[PDB]
Design a protein around this ligand. Structure first.
Ligand SMILES: Cc1nnc(C(C)C)n1[C@@H]1C[C@H]2CC[C@@H](C1)N2CC[C@H](NC(=O)C1CCCC1)c1cccs1
Ligand SMILES: [Zn+2]
Length: 339
């Protein structure tokens, strides 16, 4: 193997220090705004706080990985298992809360009348604790294999799998991270945003550019054969404006009025940004462990893919300081609050 450790000792400590500062300040501001300004009045507000905590737990580990890159593992065994633990917990709960935010929006938008009954602060609180328990238990096998050890003269913090079962463990721990961190959020994204997009469209108002008439799907146009609850897009093209009598071509889409519909932009941005930072590691991890059989094992491609894993995971670690920026730009409340 090629020694990149001499290079990593120079590069990673300043990089990890910026990410820690920027990310700690950013996530802390989100937390004080949600508890003090916003005061946690919705189910959404509970999951946002918990997501902000998941980013923080993960962030606290970053100064330790920085020092370990710089020098060696000077924190000991418990610390090695704790920080590896917090890293995995912070990772799993983070994506679990991105999934819970998506499901919350699917309920508010798709099952609106039910959501009034189901979406409460206390149900959001109850589901958060369950999520944390699931995350800790998802991280637990990984914490077991992790330990501090003196290899000759230097102290290391790594996970070591039993030699007689090494391929099995690499195989299994890869599929836990890929199923939970890529596959599971992707099915949640496709299934949920299918329903959300279909509800958003079937409920879109359209205004006539000529007379100003507003077509509302809820009302329809029953005097002209258009039954209430009809997507304007589903109306036959032989239909004309009830006021000025012009065709569908002259109709323009009305900008979203419903706040619950407007909040979709934020929660979808969070998920898409998660995939930009973490889908690269997930694919390289799957390519490394498994695809060696289904691709290449060369001393070149083995060293290339292992370096690719080092890069793609540093990129993912960066994601912990990204959500505050999203809230500052896309987040409507946060925008007016700062204004
Ligand atoms: C050490 C060290 N220096 N920097 C880092 C990253 C922040 C870039 N690291 C560690 C942090 C943790 C602890 C080891 C590894 C690199 N990292 C955990 C990576 C772990 N992926 C796996 O365990 C794979 C290896 C092959 C089978 C599973 C992840 C856990 C959650 C996301 S990634
Ligand atoms: Zn008209």
């Amino acid at each position: 193997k090629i020694n990149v450790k001499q290079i990593a000792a120079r590069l990673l400590p300043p990089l990890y220090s910026l990410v820690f500062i920027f990310g700690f300040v950013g996530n802390m501001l989100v937390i004080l705004i949600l508890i003090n300004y916003k005061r946690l009045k919705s189910m959404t507000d509970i999951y946002l706080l918990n997501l902000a905590i998941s980013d923080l737990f993960f962030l606290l580990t970053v100064p330790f990985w920085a020092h370990y890159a710089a020098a060696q593992w000077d924190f000991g065994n418990t610390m090695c298992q704790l920080l590896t633990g917090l890293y995995f917990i912070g990772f799993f709960s983070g994506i679990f809360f991105i999934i819970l935010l998506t499901i919350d929006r699917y309920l508010a938008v798709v099952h609106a009348v039910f959501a009034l009954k189901a979406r409460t602060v206390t149900f959001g609180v109850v589901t958060s604790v369950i999520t944390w328990v699931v995350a800790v238990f998802a991280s637990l096998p990984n914490i077991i294999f992790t330990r501090s050890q003196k290899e000759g003269l230097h102290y290391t913090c790594s996970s070591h799998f039993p030699y007689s079962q090494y391929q099995f463990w690499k195989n299994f721990q890869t599929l836990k991270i890929v199923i939970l961190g890529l596959v599971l959020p992707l099915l949640v994204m496709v299934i949920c945003y299918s329903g959300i997009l279909k509800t958003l469209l079937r409920m879109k108002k359209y205004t006539c550019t000529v007379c100003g008439y507003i077509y509302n799907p809820e009302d329809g146009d029953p005097d002209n054969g258009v039954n209430p609850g009809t997507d304007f897009k589903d109306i036959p093209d032989d239909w004309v404006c009830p006021l000025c009598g012009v065709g569908k071509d002259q109709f323009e889409e009305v900008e979203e009025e419903k706040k619950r519909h407007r909040d979709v932009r934020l929660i979808f941005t969070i998920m898409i940004v998660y995939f930009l930072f973490w889908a690269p590691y997930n694919i390289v991890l799957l390519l490394n462990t498994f695809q060696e059989f289904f691709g290449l094992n060369n001393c070149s491609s083995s060293n290339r893919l292992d370096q690719a894993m080092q890069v793609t995971e540093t990129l993912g670690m960066t994601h912990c300081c990204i959500n505050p920026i999203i809230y500052a730009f896309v987040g409507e409340e946060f925008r007016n609050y700062l204004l």
